[PDB]
């Protein structure tokens, strides 16, 4: 009926890791190629995603146990889950009133039409926006938001992983913390854990659709030349 | 004592090719990652160089005979000479009064200190600035400026070329046009042709030094990740 010391330490280390890799000022966005409103938003959104990938890597390096994995498993987990963590962490800037991501200014307010001008279609953007709204309606505590990103990253059912038992044990330990936190600290969160696990399933569907549309984008050199080396490396099909 | 029709057609096609790939407004520069004044200028200057490489490719495709070469020779010539043509074409924005490149605004005014903040040292920048000033003092006609870029690009003594005789014949035809133009149309240009050929030798020295410093830049992933895919492909060591 209460969390242990080792479990609250996991929560503390995860919250601090998120505060160190997510800047609420969005002042770094001025360093991206500016937004233009064919595929006029691709340069800006490619820099946005690339920048966010660096943050997800920094967040991952501070998750307990992730750094003790082999370098190959760390890469396999990051490559398969990078786009999902980005969709997850972007809920912090998503607004139900605007149905868009607001990052401090009209130039950094991204709507559905802005992502279509980056080579993507509604068959990805409709479920994406439909994913952000119900995740926003869940009204997760920050402790639950960061736990869900950690659980998503430490998923064993991802291509390329070798130590299935070591990573599953990590993910199980994070799930028990999340269940216990919601039980003790979140009133009325009786149905919340199931709803959070369902969002992981939605992320797999969003991940599959993004990879399909990214492949078509990356097969045209006039578009793939607008991407960044980190985006090409992380979303690329190279296997270790 | 006068140029033929076939030679003035070469001049016309070269001048038009330069007017189609060099915009004097520099309005596209706002789309680069903004300049910051470690290696704070690398993102902006990498976008500047990458953008300029696309222009040099467009210029090359309109040189008479270049497009009839095999795709491999075109790539070999572009990869070895890209940085030289960029140094050549940048004289148009270089100013003796400022000893810098002015591209319409203080944010797009690049001095020697700005390039040091992109990973380069004075052993490249001192000869580079010493190359721009004497090239500016030559006071080339636009017909001579574009002929020199064409001659530089169609050099046979470059790694990877296979059809040595076909490209040398092209370069020889361009040199006869340049000699004849200076003879007939440039008063007092009696010593100019030799001075222009000497600048080609200086470009080889500037090219060697840039490749050395680029290699050190590209071997550190934290810096090579700030480059563009086109820069990595053109300056890369891949051989066809």
């Amino acid at each position: 009926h209460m969390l242990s010391d080792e479990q609250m330490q996991i929560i503390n280390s995860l919250v601090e890791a998120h505060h160190k890799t997510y800047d609420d000022s969005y002042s770094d966005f001025v360093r991206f190629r500016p937004p233009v409103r064919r595929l006029s938003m691709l340069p800006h959104l490619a820099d946005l995603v690339s920048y966010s990938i660096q943050k997800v890597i920094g967040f991952a390096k501070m998750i307990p146990g992730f750094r003790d994995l082999t370098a190959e498993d760390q890469i396999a987990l990051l490559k398969s889950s990078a786009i999902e963590i980005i969709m997850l962490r972007s809920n912090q800037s998503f607004s139900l009133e605007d149905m868009s991501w607001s990052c401090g200014g009209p130039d950094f307010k991204y709507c559905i039409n802005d992502v279509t001008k980056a080579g993507h279609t509604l068959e990805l953007l409709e479920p994406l926006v439909k994913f952000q709204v119900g995740l926003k309606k869940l009204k997760l505590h920050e402790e639950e938001h960061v736990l869900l990103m950690a659980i998503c990253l430490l998923s064993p059912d991802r291509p390329g992983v070798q130590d299935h038992v070591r990573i599953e044990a990590l993910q199980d330990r994070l799930c028990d913390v999340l269940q216990a936190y919601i039980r003790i600290q979140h009133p009325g969160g009786r149905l919340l854990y199931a709803k959070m696990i369902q969002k992981l399933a939605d992320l797999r569907s969003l991940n599959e659709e993004h990879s399909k549309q990214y492949r078509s984008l990356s097969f045209q050199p006039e578009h793939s030349m607008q991407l960044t080396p980190l985006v090409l490396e992380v979303f690329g099909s190279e296997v270790s | 004592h006068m140029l033929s029709d076939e030679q003035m057609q070469i001049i016309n096609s070269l001048v038009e090719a330069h007017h189609k790939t060099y915009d004097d407004s520099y309005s596209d520069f706002v789309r680069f990652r903004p300049p910051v004044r470690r290696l704070s200028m690398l993102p902006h200057l990498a976008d500047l160089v990458s953008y300029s490489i696309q222009k040099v490719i467009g210029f090359a495709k309109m040189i008479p005979g270049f497009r009839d070469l095999t795709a491999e020779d075109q790539i070999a010539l572009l990869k070895s000479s890209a940085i030289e043509i960029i140094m050549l074409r940048s004289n148009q924005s270089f100013s003796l009064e400022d000893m810098s490149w002015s591209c319409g605004g203080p944010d797009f005014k690049y001095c020697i200190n700005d390039v040091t903040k992109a990973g380069h040292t004075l052993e490249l920048l001192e000869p580079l600035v010493k190359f721009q000033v004497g090239l500016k003092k030559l006071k080339l006609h636009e017909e001579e400026h574009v002929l020199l870029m064409a001659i530089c690009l169609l050099s046979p003594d470059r790694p990877g070329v296979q059809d040595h005789v076909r490209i040398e014949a092209l370069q020889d035809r361009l040199c006869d046009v340049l000699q004849a133009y200076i003879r007939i149309q440039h008063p007092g240009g009696r010593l100019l042709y030799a001075k222009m050929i000497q600048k080609l030798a200086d470009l080889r020295s500037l090219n060697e030094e840039h490749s050395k410093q680029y290699r050190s830049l590209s071997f550190q992933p934290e810096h090579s990740m700030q480059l563009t895919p086109l820069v990595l492909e053109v300056f890369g060591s891949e051989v066809s």
């Binding site: 890597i57 890469i75 990051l78 980190l230 490396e233 190279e238 270790s240 | 992933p221 090579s224």
Partner: peptide, 11 residues
Amino acid sequence: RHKILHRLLQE
């Protein structure tokens, strides 16, 4: 081969 990832993943 995962050059940028390896660098970013180390200290």
